[PDB]
Design a protein around this ligand. Structure first.
Ligand SMILES: *C[C@@](*)(O)[C@H](CCCNC(N)=[NH2+])NC(=O)[C@@H]1CCCN1C(=O)[C@H](N)Cc1ccccc1
Ligand SMILES: *[C@@H]1O[C@H](CO)[C@@H](O)[C@H](O)[C@H]1NC(C)=O
Ligand SMILES: [Cl-]
Ligand SMILES: [Cl-]
Ligand SMILES: [K+]
Ligand code: NA
Ligand SMILES: [Zn+2]
Ligand SMILES: [Zn+2]
Lengths: 27, 250
DNA sequence: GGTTGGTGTGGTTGG
């Protein structure tokens, strides 16, 4: 489905300012 | 949101604001799960202890809205509600068990760069992401401290182990709830607060890069207190009820 | 214009 992908971020291959923090908590 | 920061434009396009129609008043947060359905917390619509019991006609929702005060012509959108559905076993008398409601919009909203739905988790998604230590994200227009921002606020917080969540309070916790926040001195702070109920607790999946709503801001005791944790409705645990409503009344 | 038209002592709304 078309959900969970943001036009201004994921679709343009851009990270928002703090998502990296989330990704690192997984490891 | 206590100790969060300003949200960049387009960073939470599934954010929905719930308004009392007359007079206009900002009540709660909510989230967009499809072009015609919005998710929120049941206590935002029904809570007798505060003389609260709304019907469809009494409310409206705003979507794609970045500023509390000005109307961003052709960017934000508005919809009236066709119907409201509260979980049949929502327990407002004791502990807000199953604090969840669906709202069906009168007219589907068109998606844009500022408006898009967030995903709901399935079983493999819930199993690998909902783990003590992993961090999620909460957004909202609620109080900035325990008792009003101009820009949507954002805070990242770690999910906490159930025994800790349970020992931190005397309210009966259930499997339909999970808590999040930092421990007594992990150095950092942050929490949701009153007015943020209904807003989403989301997680970005490291397997397909999509954002999933794992929780709904539900309750707490004070906001951002040392040794206290914010509580959230467990979306996946109540997914069958969600799907049946959409399927039958969609 | 803007992330958005065609006009405002704005507007459902700032400058
Ligand atoms: C309705 C929401 O905006 C709000 C969210 C609060 C989130 N707070 C923190 N720290 N993360 N929820 C509430 O205010 C709920 C509704 C009923 C009262 N409540 C509380 O959270 C009381 N503070 C505690 C409570 C009282 C009765 C039953 C359950 C919880
Ligand atoms: C809320 O109000 C409706 C009528 O508007 C009533 O039928 C419903 O049972 C009420 N819920 C409460 C107060 O438990
Ligand atoms: Cl009333
Ligand atoms: Cl009354
Ligand atoms: K203008
Ligand atoms: Na806390
Ligand atoms: Zn799309
Ligand atoms: Zn009354």
């Amino acid at each position: 489905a078309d959900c969970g992908l943001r036009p201004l971020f994921e679709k343009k291959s851009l990270e928002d300012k703090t998502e990296r923090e989330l990704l690192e908590s997984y490891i | 949101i206590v100790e969060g920061s300003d949200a960049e434009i387009g960073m939470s396009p599934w954010q929905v604001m719930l308004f009392r129609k007359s007079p206009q008043e900002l009540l709660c947060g909510a989230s967009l799960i499809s072009d015609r359905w919005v998710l929120t917390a049941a206590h935002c619509l029904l809570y007798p202890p505060w003389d609260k019991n709304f019907t469809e006609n009494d409310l409206l929702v705003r979507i794609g809205k970045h500023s509390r005060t000005r109307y961003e012509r052709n960017i934000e959108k508005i919809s009236m509600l066709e119907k409201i559905y509260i979980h049949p076993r929502y327990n407002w008398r004791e502990n807000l068990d199953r604090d969840i409601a669906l709202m069906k919009l009168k007219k589907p909203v068109a998606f844009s760069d500022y408006i898009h739905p967030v995903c709901l988790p399935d079983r493999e998604t819930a199993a690998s992401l909902l783990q003590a230590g992993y961090k999620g994200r909460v957004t909202g227009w609620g109080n900035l401290k325990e008792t009003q921002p101009s820009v949507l606020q954002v805070v990242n917080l770690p999910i906490v182990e159930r025994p800790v969540c349970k020992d931190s309070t005397r309210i009966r916790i259930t499997d339909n709830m999970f808590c999040a926040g930092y421990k007594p001195d992990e150095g950092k702070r942050g929490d949701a607060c009153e007015g943020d109920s209904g807003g989403p607790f989301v997680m970005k999946s490291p397997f397909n890069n999509r954002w999933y709503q794992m929780g709904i801001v539900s309750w707490g005791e004070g906001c951002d207190r040392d040794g206290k944790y914010g509580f959230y409705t467990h979306v996946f645990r109540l997914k069958k009820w969600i799907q049946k409503v959409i399927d039958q009344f969609g």
